[PDB]
Design a protein around this ligand. Structure first.
Ligand SMILES: [Ca+2]
Ligand SMILES: [Ca+2]
Ligand SMILES: [Ca+2]
Ligand SMILES: [Cl-]
Ligand SMILES: [Cl-]
Ligand SMILES: [Cl-]
Lengths: 458, 458, 458
């Protein structure tokens, strides 16, 4: 009696789960919104510098209109290698944002010290792998909260707390090629093994190298650590990068998971649209919304408010034809990266709509109870839109100088709605709806032409 | 000199052969129509209860318009596992009809007893594998005839005879989870090994278990049995589920095989249409045609008549824009499951056309010589249309409460054309073309609203 | 720590490189045009007789409109097997033209004798593999030049010299199933091992068999030969047919390589169009342009002129909506196989345009300096268009009786523009723009109806 080859089945649930971390795939929590969970772990925030520049170069004529295709190919080739290291070292990739990603090692408190060693080693091997591109890595460790928010058909999650703020601070300090530990990470780690240098004006520290003691064997140490890793592929599945590759059809589970994924990606998963379609360099408008709270580390304070804001944001975006691409803690608060002009959401009046949408969101969110300040940055231009990451773990994202510009506007001009000149000039709105603003020198930004506040009708 | 990896070639002929049993793939018989062949074998008829209900639930809002996708995924996940067992145990899947399939073990007469043991074991392992779904299995054994019928561009086959009637009777008696043997099967089997209980008012019997004798080893027994299995994958191809996976391009053979497959499936095979396209939950009209004969077991009596009827059915369907989905022996006769509204055959007046087509077919077939009675049931609603089965053996089929309703109408209201209320109400035809009928309690049917006879113009 | 399966990545650069020989993929030469390189090698020219006939038969009704699909499947099944032998024996397939291909073994001069043995053995194994189809093979050896020509967005290459003329002469003499050596090949080969018969009126010779000496072992001999093969897959990659299967994303390299591939193929590579789309049997017009030079073996004489002609040809084709399918040395000169009506280049007035384009090209090229004679043959009909070869090495090409007719017209009627009757009759041009020509008996051609010179306006 034969025992024939059992071919890999790439069921739709498996393709869906590629777009999500184990934190959600195997999370099985309440459908109530908001939902909050608390745990500890080590976070790794990995940034590839230079793709933003590259994006602008891939619109040039030398790319012969295959710029999007070339950009995603060279990006994924690099990012995939990083994704594999994170996964082999036992991490869960939580989210991709442009050419960066955030990974988590969730463990019990007693195991943070040893897991920190594992992550540092991971980081050094990644810093290893890496012709104009640098890798910067920030690490943090401690208490983490998760929030899930959304409505009956859409779900989103985010992580919150001091470790989340710390990992992003650590990463902003990294010079090209550094691995930086948060103060708390340094404080919890196995200092007898990890050799650091101080960072000026900073309690965070830079990793120089591992200094293992005499009888230390990393493979044996790693194996002990896998005891604590719930989803590490093992035994018969030790040849797989993710346990999620073995997920089996389950309509309840798939209904729950699909709510995290955008409709155009589900179309592609369901072989109702060609893959090529989602890799594009297209003119869009970014609307980058920031909500600042009294205490951005206290999930049960901020969770209700994010949900409240999300309910209004989503209904307004539906009307003005925009979409939430990503949400994360960023700029002392919760940020929504929204996009006008994604697959199948073209219009004329896109610019006007992005501006009217932004004002509406600003007025509403300004009044929701624990929101201290709202800031919104609007910028328009050619940006890369596509699926970034590894075959087994990837997400739809946007990369482009205008994406960064909108984020920087929202941070340097708090408490108002701002726009760039392309949006100002392009919009059908009268000039006295706007105010020309003082030019601020902005981190990471060369020369935006004039910037404007969208004052609205008075 | 290298000996490089020889990658699997999924030639078009191989993809075609996935839609057909070895009985046709390796049959090499005359292109003359009708063509009849005679042999012996054991038949297995496997039914998954509950998908029909599920279908109705997958149109609900909780499925967020991915109902078709979810339904086919969960169906195929289960059915594929059954298909693999049948194939590993040496059977040929002849046909899929909704969430059921029919499998054949064709052997010489002297080998029926031993092969019956093999099939029972197969059945018990399948009953094994199987959250609202039961598996019912009927087995029969004996003489079988095959008919091939069609025209210069389309071919169809069916099996006929007492064993075919018996396997369907056996399966209608199975309580959830039973394996039932036909009287003749019980009479030919190795009774010293097979422990049964009687079935009330019935000569068919229920399998309780296998009671192997002392030195009996199933693997060695199975291996002896493979001597008689012409196409069992072996040697270098023992890792494959079907020998058909090795078929090589042959234009003569492919011309012959493609005639069994519908044009929209050939389009997909030829990568001229996205796969997603054929899995749908769409409103259609089922026209379920039954031809009753004096003796439905005598192929050479009935074969000419089925061909005659097919020639007219197909020309009328072409005019009224319908398609034959499936043909089989069912309801004391030969049944054609026809569909109005399949990929690319949308229209308005679909309902009217289905009714005029049904009348035309009724008048013509009523006059063909050995056809004793014609019955036709017409029902309209949302039904699942798609490819069901395993990667290596699958077919296009329809599942839905309206499919069952049309079959039951055709059986409970013989000798006339009947329709449901959706069709009555929806049609552009005057009310006095119809007659409102007495409500009959029907096996498997809750509450069809009113039913009607399509009387026609008088 | 796991070491998980590293799945084959079929990056776009890899898919591009399938369409090109190692001579270009790993060539890294100047982007200047024309560019010329010089080396030595052995050439193999392999022709499958009979597909041209088959093409005409695959338009018949028995193919039920899947003629293109069937033709490409049966063609590729045969051609793929030849491609694998060439590759396993260490050759580089340079180009496909219809049902023929040209392969190169590039080596240093001292190694030609031994490599000739390898190629003969290859040829005999191929003649081995080969229901109406014969394989004819011609071999040549010696000095070879390569020319690359084109503009900022398109590139083409060709090989030139006596060995290139010889391999095509050798192949025209081969009777069904022969392997023929050029005079120079015979002169350089290891005559103590290769047993030949003379060919009447010819210095070229026919291979009867290999006569190895006593201690000769072909595997050991082949292994010694692999020392000289730069790109032979080895070690960890010994299971691959081409080293190109391992190419890694590199935007510079991909920009350079894509210029050789037509836009509709890049569309398919980029998953922006279904694969089925490019296999077609469609009515087109072939415009077969031949440039004759004083000395067609002297690349530095002829290279500038081919570039000059290409610059004008391409701009005129752009205007009249044609495309260069292929360029090669053929008919005592450089030939351009151009096509009117390829994917997405339909029009009415196609025939007129092909004729006005041909005249324009004739007038211009007639005046470029070292071009002695221009001849152009125009023929219209149903031809097969599609990707021919092996998964790892394949190209877009055209096969059809009208392709051959246009080539034969251009050779038998030199120095003028000629057209067939379909084109004459179909064109919107007045009859006195043409002259009816004397019927010539033409090699490989049954009965073209009348042929015409396109005289133009006087
Ligand atoms: Ca970045
Ligand atoms: Ca059923
Ligand atoms: Ca040829
Ligand atoms: Cl997050
Ligand atoms: Cl049947
Ligand atoms: Cl060439």
């Amino acid at each position: 009696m034969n025992t024939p080859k059992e071919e890999f089945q790439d069921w739709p649930i498996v393709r869906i789960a590629a777009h999500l971390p184990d934190l959600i795939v195997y999370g099985h929590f309440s459908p109530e919104r908001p939902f909050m969970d608390y745990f500890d772990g080590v976070l790794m925030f990995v940034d590839i510098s230079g793709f933003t520049a590259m994006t602008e170069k891939f619109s040039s004529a030398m790319y012969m209109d295959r710029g999007a295709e070339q950009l995603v190919e060279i990006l994924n080739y690099h990012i995939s290698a990083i994704v594999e290291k994170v996964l082999i070292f036992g991490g869960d990739i939580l989210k991709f944002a442009g050419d960066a990603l955030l990974a988590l090692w969730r463990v019990e408190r007693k195991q943070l010290k040893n897991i920190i060693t594992v992550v540092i080693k991971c980081s050094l091997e990644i810093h290893g792998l890496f012709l104009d591109i640098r890798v910067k890595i920030g690490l943090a460790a401690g208490h983490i909260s998760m929030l899930v928010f959304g409505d009956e058909t859409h779900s989103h999650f985010l992580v919150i707390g001091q470790a989340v703020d710390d990992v992003r601070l650590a990463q902003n300090m990294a010079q090209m090629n550094d691995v930086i530990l948060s103060p708390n990470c340094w404080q919890l780690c196995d200092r007898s093994m990890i050799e650091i240098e101080s960072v000026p004006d900073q309690r965070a520290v830079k990793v120089n190298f591992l200094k293992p003691p005499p009888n230390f064997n990393f493979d044996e140490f790693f194996t002990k650590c896998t005891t604590f890793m719930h989803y590490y592929p093992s035994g018969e599945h030790k040849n797989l990068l993710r346990l999620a590759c073995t997920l089996k059809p389950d309509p309840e589970l798939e209904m729950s998971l699909q709510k995290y994924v955008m409709e155009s990606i589900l179309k592609q998963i369901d072989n109702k649209q060609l893959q090529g379609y989602l890799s594009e360099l297209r003119p869009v408008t970014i609307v980058f919304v920031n909500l600042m709270f009294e205490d951005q580390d206290k999930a049960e304070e901020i969770g209700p408010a994010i949900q409240d804001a999300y309910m209004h944001i989503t209904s307004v975006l539906k009307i003005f034809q925009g979409q939430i691409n990503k949400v994360f803690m960023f700029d002392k608060g919760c940020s929504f990266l929204c996009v006008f002009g994604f697959p199948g959401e073209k219009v004329p009046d896109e610019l006007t709509h992005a501006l009217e949408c932004a004002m509406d969101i600003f007025d509403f969110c300004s009044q929701v109870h624990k929101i201290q300040t709202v800031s919104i940055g609007v910028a328009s231009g050619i940006v890369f839109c596509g699926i970034v990451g590894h075959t087994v773990r990837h997400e739809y994202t946007v990369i482009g100088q205008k994406v960064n510009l909108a984020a920087r506007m929202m941070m340097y001009y708090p408490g108002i709605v701002t726009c760039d000149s392309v949006t100002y000039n392009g919009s059908n709105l009268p000039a006295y709806f706007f105010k020309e603003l003082p030019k601020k020198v902005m981190k990471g930004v060369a020369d935006s032409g004039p910037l404007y506040q969208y004052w609205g009708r008075t």
